[PDB]
Amino acid sequence: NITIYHNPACGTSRNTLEMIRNSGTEPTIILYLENPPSRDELVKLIADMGISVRALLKKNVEPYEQLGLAEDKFTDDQLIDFMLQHPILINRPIVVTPLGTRLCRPSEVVLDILQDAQKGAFTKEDGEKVVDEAGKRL
Ligand SMILES: [Cs+]
Ligand SMILES: [Cs+]
Ligand SMILES: [Cs+]
Ligand SMILES: [Cs+]
Ligand SMILES: [Cs+]
């Protein structure tokens, strides 16, 4: 039972999705930009990810800029509510498996929470080798 909060336009997100598949399972895919998590779900994801709320914020997007979120003037719950109202602010991808939840940045972080080993070598779309045929991380 695996869930990925996915942006098809994000390289990291695509690489993550394919490494999930290369472990032998097809995840549930949530297009978070159109279908974001509810507040309770987002609070849980952050807790499980063990990062700060601010660490989940995506920079270099219109609401981050226009809402001035770079500045340290926002409580965690103010930031959580911005993410729910403007889901492009949620960094990506987030993956949930029976072992845990991670912000998979870089994509190969997902290897931590995939229960089954990569079934063969994995090379990222830009050619960066990740695991060899033997299964060793490079
Ligand atoms: Cs499986
Ligand atoms: Cs939801
Ligand atoms: Cs806009
Ligand atoms: Cs693992
Ligand atoms: Cs890249």
User: What is the resolution of the experimental data for this entry, in Å?
Assistant: 1.6
Distance 61 CA to ligand 3 centre (A): 10
Structural biology method used: X-ray
User: How many alpha carbons fall within 13 Å on the CB side of residue 36?
Assistant: 19
Distance 111 CA to ligand 2 centre (A): 25
Residues with CB under 5 A from ligand 2 (ion): 38
CA-to-CA distance for 39 and 136, rounded, in angstroms? 38
Q: CB under 8 Å to 6, separation ≥6 — which residues? A: 13, 16, 17, 29, 30, 31, 32, 92, 93
- Tokens linked to 37: 């998590």
* Ramachandran angles phi, psi of 92, nearest 5°: -155, 150
Per-domain residue ranges of the chain: 1-138
CA-to-CA distance for 109 and 113, rounded, in angstroms? 8
Q: Taking CA 57 as the corner, what is the angle to CA 54 and CA 60, rounded to the nearest 5 degrees? A: 130
In CATH terms, 1-138 corresponds, of 3.30.457.10, 1.10.150.670, 3.40.30.10, 1.10.3720.10, to 3.40.30.10
Buried b (16+ CB within 10 A) or exposed e, 43-70: eebbeebeeebeebbbeeeebbeebebe
Catalytic (active site) residue 104: no
Catalytic one among 1, 6, 10, 109? 10
Q: CB under 8 Å to 75, separation ≥6 — which residues? A: none
Distances from the Cα of 5 to the Cα of 34, 103, 133, 137, angstroms: 11, 10, 28, 24
Residue 79 host element (H or E): helix 76-85
Strands annotated E in 88-134: 94-97, 100-103, 122-123, 129-131
* Cα radius of gyration rounded to whole Å, the chain: 15
Residues with CB under 5 A from ligand 5 (ion): 126
- DSSP string spanning 4-53? EE--TT-HHHHHHHHHHHHTT---EEE-TTTSPPPHHHHHHHHHHHTS-T
- Tokens linked to 40: 């309770």
Residue 3 host element (H or E): strand 3-5
Distance 79 CA to ligand 4 centre (A): 31
Distance 69 CA to ligand 4 centre (A): 34
